């Protein structure tokens, strides 16, 4: 049942709407990445609310959790797409927004892209199955919270424990659990760098001609600073 549900609600392909015949400039690439974030968020919200037990969370906690984990969720899914499509050769953000070495450099996110390709490669090196991927991604949604707790922290804690149990069931083993939890932890440092980069970019967006959609601009200025200031922190296993 659990896996049936995860497979049924998994989001489909999402395009960035990037004009590929235009020069690879910083402004053009990040305006497209920003738009893609706006588009993937829409799918992530519907995905999360359809997750087993998610609705048990307080309404305000639901939105908060989705916004705090959006970056990591997108990174993880992206690494899996790149692995399954181009075999981690390039970064497959969207069918119409694939990053090669030139784009990695022009986006001024080269170092982060390298780490993301490393993650993508892990899917191959660890021979991660579609089921493991699905369970792990669901767990990622429940991996970052306010140090002072959510409105209803007990429900969240209960749910997170349940999802950890499901990952354990899919594996069933100790070596595998060690490897998968290590992989999940590796997403956070990456998300953090993207969060920092995104924040700085928003602040100076008017000077570098980069456009940010409404919802992304709100999340970057309201939720992301909470993470960068230490009020909201990821839940590491190790
Ligand atoms: C630079 C940026 O455009 C910032 S953003 O999308 O507006 C954003 C704003 C706030 C967040 F919490 C998360 C993401 C970005 O990280 N976009 C983005 C778009 C698509 C994908 C994918 N797939 C990813 C990444 F997760 F893979 F890095 C990142």
Swiss-Prot record:
Positions bearing the site annotation: Interaction with coactivator FXXLF and FXXFY motifs: 218
Q: Where in the cell is it found?
A: Nucleus; Cytoplasm
Q: What is the effect of changing residue 59 to M?
A: In prostate cancer; increases transcription activation
Q: What is the effect of changing residue 72 to V?
A: In PAIS and AIS
**What does the UniProt entry list as the effect of changing residue 201 to Q?**
In prostate cancer
Instruction: Cite the effect that the entry attributes to residue 30 to A.
Output: Alters receptor specificity, so that transcription is activated by the antiandrogen cyproterone acetate
Consequence recorded when altering residue 120 to P: In prostate cancer and AIS
Marked site, Interaction with coactivator LXXL and FXXFY motifs, at 49
UniProt-reported outcome of changing residue 12 to A: Found in prostate cancer
Q: What happens after mutating residue 109 to I?
A: In PAIS and AIS
Family, according to the entry, reads as follows: Belongs to the nuclear hormone receptor family. NR3 subfamily.
Self-association and partners: Binds DNA as a homodimer. Part of a ternary complex containing AR, EFCAB6/DJBP and PARK7. Interacts with HIPK3 and NR0B2 in the presence of androgen. The ligand binding domain interacts with KAT7/HBO1 in the presence of dihydrotestosterone. Interacts with EFCAB6/DJBP, PQBP1, RANBP9, RBAK, SPDEF, SRA1, TGFB1I1 and RREB1. Interacts with ZMIZ1/ZIMP10 and ZMIZ2/ZMIP7 which both enhance its transactivation activity. Interacts with SLC30A9 and RAD54L2/ARIP4. Interacts with MACROD1 (via macro domain).
- Reported function: Steroid hormone receptors are ligand-activated transcription factors that regulate eukaryotic gene expression and affect cellular proliferation and differentiation in target tissues. Transcription factor activity is modulated by bound coactivator and corepressor proteins like ZBTB7A that recruits NCOR1 and NCOR2 to the androgen response elements/ARE on target genes, negatively regulating androgen receptor signaling and androgen-induced cell proliferation. Transcription activation is also down-regulated by NR0B2. Activated, but not phosphorylated, by HIPK3 and ZIPK/DAPK3.
Protein name as it appears in the record: Androgen receptor
- The gene for this chain is AR
